[PDB]
Amino acid sequence: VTLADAGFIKQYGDCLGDIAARDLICAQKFNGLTVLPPLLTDEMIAQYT
Amino acid sequence: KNKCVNFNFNGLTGTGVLTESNKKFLPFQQFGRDIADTTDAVRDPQTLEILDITPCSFGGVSVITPGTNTSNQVAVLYQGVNCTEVPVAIHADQLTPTWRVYSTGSNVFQTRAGCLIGAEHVNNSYECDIPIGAGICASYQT
Amino acid sequence: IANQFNSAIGKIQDSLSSTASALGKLQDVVNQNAQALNTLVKQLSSNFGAISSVLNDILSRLDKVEAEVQIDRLITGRLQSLQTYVTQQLIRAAEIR
Amino acid sequence: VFNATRFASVYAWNRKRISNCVADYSVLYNSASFSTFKCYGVSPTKLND
Numbered sequence A: 001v002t003l004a005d006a007g008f009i010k011q012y013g014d015c016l017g018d019i020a021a022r023d024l025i026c027a028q029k030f031n032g033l034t035v036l037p038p039l040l041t042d043e044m045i046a047q048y049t
Numbered sequence B: 001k002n003k004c005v006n007f008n009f010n011g012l013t014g015t016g017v018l019t020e021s022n023k024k025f026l027p028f029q030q031f032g033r034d035i036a037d038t039t040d041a042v043r044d045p046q047t048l049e050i051l052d053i054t055p056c057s058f059g060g061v062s063v064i065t066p067g068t069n070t071s072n073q074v075a076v077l078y079q080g081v082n083c084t085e086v087p088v089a090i091h092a093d094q095l096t097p098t099w100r101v102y103s104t105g106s107n108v109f110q111t112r113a114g115c116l117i118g119a120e121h122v123n124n125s126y127e128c129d130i131p132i133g134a135g136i137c138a139s140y141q142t
Numbered sequence C: 001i002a003n004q005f006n007s008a009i010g011k012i013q014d015s016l017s018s019t020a021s022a023l024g025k026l027q028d029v030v031n032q033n034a035q036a037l038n039t040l041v042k043q044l045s046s047n048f049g050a051i052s053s054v055l056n057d058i059l060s061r062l063d064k065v066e067a068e069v070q071i072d073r074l075i076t077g078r079l080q081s082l083q084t085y086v087t088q089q090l091i092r093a094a095e096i097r
Numbered sequence D: 001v002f003n004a005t006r007f008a009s010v011y012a013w014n015r016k017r018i019s020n021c022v023a024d025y026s027v028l029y030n031s032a033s034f035s036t037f038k039c040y041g042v043s044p045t046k047l048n049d
Ligand SMILES: *[C@@H]1O[C@H](CO)[C@@H](O[C@@H]2O[C@H](CO)[C@@H](O)[C@H](O)[C@H]2NC(C)=O)[C@H](O)[C@H]1NC(C)=O
Pocket: A009, A011, B082, B083, B084, B110
């Protein structure tokens, strides 16, 4: 299963200049549509499991 | 370039940071466009270079509180923000939030959810009190 | 009984290491989440009967009073595009719950 | 265009290219001489911008 963003820290580093064009997540983000991270990380889910 | 500005190219008004583009506009083009039908690159009509337009930095802001009955002290989370973009949130570049005492720093923390200010990071783990995201919580304690 | 268990767990690795589509129930959730945000970004490109889909093309070209008749079309259509997304997400969240 | 001595008959209406020039439309719109001045996808107030 391959995810389309996970809320992990879009730094203004990558999404500025080049990746603004070729990534749907920047077109979403620039229009006020943001993804929030889950409270339990995939490491915390694996510790419970 | 590299500053947030009110641009206008040939009547094409907008707001954003202008940046050096690597794009390859053919001689008949003047603007590049997005999936959203908004422009995102433009050719300067005086020196024929291509400028990437990007919007000025923004995010959600969220306020963390033990409640008014416990204290009037709060911590602020800037959602999806690296800490270096809060020194960019200086009063010289007037932001939508007029308040700013948080920018005094010293207790700035970076989480995968965003930049957290006014909360003290500690190595001790506890049961989650107020959930911040990406494995982090906050609580009001001695 | 142990050799049959160890062989049966072996076939879980072989199946998951082989076929592309076994997690189709989880990839469908990611695909529905992504499709709804990509559809919501596409509804920004629509005019809804305004002279342009872009507020800067209305606010550069029209005066303060002829602009509002165009801006309210874009507000009306977008506001329905958010109420559609949030209704789809509230219905879809009950499937996931 | 506007002060040319002879206008065309409507059955053979004239068409002039306006090109590589600055157009101060405030001078055209400020003149009270025009009995009608109607703009159909733009406001006459904005033509200078
Ligand atoms: C926050 O932004 C800073 C840059 O302003 C990032 O620091 C860089 O991180 C990379 C990868 O670890 C290093 O190669 C660089 O040398 C770092 N630069 C500096 C000036 O220290 C930092 O990683 C960002 N953090 C997050 C979570 O976004």
